[PDB]
Paper text:
We thus used the truncated NprR(ΔHTH) form of the protein, deleted of the HTH domains, which are known to be highly flexible in the absence of DNA. Because crystallisation trials are performed at very high protein concentration favouring the tetrameric form of NprR, we also used the (Y223A/F225A) mutant that has been shown to impair tetramer formation. Crystals were finally obtained with the truncated double mutant protein NprR(ΔHTH)(Y223A/F225A). They diffracted up to 3.25Å resolution in space group P 21 21 21 with 2 molecules per asymmetric unit. In both polypeptide chains contained in the asymmetric unit, the 18 α-helices and the connecting loops forming the 9 TPR motifs of NprR are well defined. The two subunits (called apoA and apoB) display the right-handed superhelix conformation characteristic of TPR domains. They are associated into a stable dimer characterized by an overall interface area of 1113Å2 and a solvation free energy gain ΔiG of -18 kcal/mol. In particular, the dimerization interface involving the C-terminal residues N407 and Y410, which was observed in the NprR/NprX complex, is conserved in the apo dimer. Comparison of the two subunits of the apo NprR dimer demonstrated that, due to distinct crystal packing constraints, the pitch of the superhelix formed by the 9 TPR motifs of the protein is larger in apoB than in apoA. This discrepancy, characterized by a Z-score of 7.9 and an rmsd distance of 1.99Å over 293 aligned Cα atoms, reflects the elasticity of the superhelix and suggests that, in solution and in the absence of NprX, the protein dynamically oscillates between distinct conformations.
Previously, we showed that this process is regulated by the sensor NprR, which, in the presence of its cognate signaling peptide NprX, adopts a tetrameric conformation allowing its binding to specific DNA sequences and transcription of genes involved in survival of the bacteria in insect cadavers. Here, we demonstrate that, in the absence of NprX, NprR is a dimer, which negatively controls sporulation, independently of its transcription factor activity. We show that NprR prevents the phosphorylation of the phosphoprotein Spo0F and inhibits the phosphorylation cascade regulating sporulation. This demonstrates that NprX binding switches the bifunctional sensor NprR from a dimeric sporulation inhibitor to a tetrameric transcription factor. Interestingly, NprR contains both the HTH DNA-binding domain and the two Rap-like additional TPR motifs, and was thus proposed as an evolutionary intermediate in the RNPP family.
Numbering used by the authors:
A (entry chain B): 67 to 418
B (entry chain A): 64 to 418
The structure:
Amino acid sequence: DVEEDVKGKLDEWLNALVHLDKQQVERIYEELQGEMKHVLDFEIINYYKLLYTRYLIMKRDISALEEELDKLKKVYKKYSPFQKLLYMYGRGLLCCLQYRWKDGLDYLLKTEVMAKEQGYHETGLYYNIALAYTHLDIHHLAIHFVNMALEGFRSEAKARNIINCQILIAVSYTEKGQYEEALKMYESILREATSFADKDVLLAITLSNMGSIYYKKGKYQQAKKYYLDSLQLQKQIDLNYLDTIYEMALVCIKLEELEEARTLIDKGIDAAKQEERFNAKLYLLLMLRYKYFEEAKDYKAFLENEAIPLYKSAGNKIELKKVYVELAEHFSSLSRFEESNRYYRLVIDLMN
Amino acid sequence: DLRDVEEDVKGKLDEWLNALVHLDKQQVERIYEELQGEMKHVLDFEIINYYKLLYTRYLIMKRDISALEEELDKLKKVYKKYSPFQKLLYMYGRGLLCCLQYRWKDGLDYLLKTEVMAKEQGYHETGLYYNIALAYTHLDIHHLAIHFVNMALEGFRSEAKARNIINCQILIAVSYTEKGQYEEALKMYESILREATSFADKDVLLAITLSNMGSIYYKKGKYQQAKKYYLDSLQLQKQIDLNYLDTIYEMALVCIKLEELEEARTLIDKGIDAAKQEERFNAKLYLLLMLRYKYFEEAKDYKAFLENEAIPLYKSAGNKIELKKVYVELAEHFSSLSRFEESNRYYRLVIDLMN
């Protein structure tokens, strides 16, 4: 009977896990570990076990999540409709963390239809669904859920999530649509003045995209300022950082600033050798240096003997296509259209 | 009085809806002719337009594209002020319109918005999921195609509609075929060979399966098997339609690989005359005509037909899939005539269509 407070304590831990109050999550997680050893009601135990999976995604532990999620898998039959709900939710987030967006979406969609049946709501769910749809390129459905997520997030007055939705919205309308509508969304982010944790991380991304938008619009001077501001906001060395440098180095070329361009390129290269995680990005910067600061004779040489054989290792995306097009454009520029056709045909075979 | 006249019409309109959703052709035609004698009595703006949107679905079922536009272009400006369900009917009809016109990318765009409106109104249609996946198939986006058939599949399962369930299985095996997994697709088609016998239209199910199987044996290299599966498919094709033109076009290619040109030459002429009759087959008519010129007409005449008739036709209608095919043939042609610069030109054009 005394474990009915733990039942309520498990519900309190649920609130801290939904609104992501990490300071409250940790104190309850510790308090429970001592009290969870005594209680032996499996509708109360499996409650904690599933909330732990929710705790694991907050602690970004994929491996431990996979372990536990596979354990609860067999016990799924005898769960409560709400406990059944949490399992489907956890696997969705797992696949999202494993970037299996199609598999995650299936789980997250079931997570929605269960929540509706038993009359349960969580604003984070809509966001994840929207993030799922977005990362696998379904625009209309992504926008649908990200609005409902945004509506709920405004009612909860959490500015961090507000921007996250606004970023997604602006990104989607940028992928296929007018930039003037996407720029105002980014502009709305900058005007926003509620200071929170890692707001500067979001602004770094916001500025990075605006730099890209204005780069496509031809407005190079403005784009460079946005790239510059982004870089100085960036505190990491992640993939998003190497992108902005590569993009900014392009702007310097457009603005007849080959010195600043090469400097940025060299820094990108030096920062890319650091890890094998972005080994692909490394050669993108090399190609850029051969293209503008080396002989075209050597640029072709690097593309044929270094670039192409590198992307034998899962360069299947734009990277390998990029190398083929550049070579194709190279020969057709020298009016040597035969070799140009050869590489052009390879581009078609790749985009099968 | 006039008031109860409409009350019964609304009921009869809702009945016409379910017949148009569950595809009851004999029931659709029945209510359709009945409504025409009743719809001239009702004058309610809400009810009249409700009928007009439903009438579009009739035109889709009757596959009357030329009349399908006129009804939609008549509503393209004012539909925004209708009831929210009338919008969904408009977006849906417009979506399938693009599909019937082989503008799948545009069709998908409308269908996806239709699904968004579906969730907004608390009303979904399992048939919609299928069409979305069908559009996703022609766009070669198979991972999303598979995503939507599974929703349609489980939808069709709960609705106990075993016939449409098979349609999903066929579509699944199609994506697997394009995904390179030929063996798992064949074994999937064999399972349909047993399932087919349970339905009335079994002969049209076999013709499709035997066709798609023959296509797999064609991609493997087993051409002698390819013809046998195609021949059995054609022998069941007693109805001249889209599927007929697919089988007879694909078989012609098989007779080319088997160096049986005379039979291939015969098949094309039969397929050409078939497509000339109904103008819904213009896409495949000029596709069949390209085969006629590629092998049995001189190269210059083949080139002339591509530049002056093929491209203009596939440019008028946004049938980019076929326009891609024409560009490659022109690119490969000039490449043989050592006119690489003009060949190179078309290679740049075909890449733009893939982005």
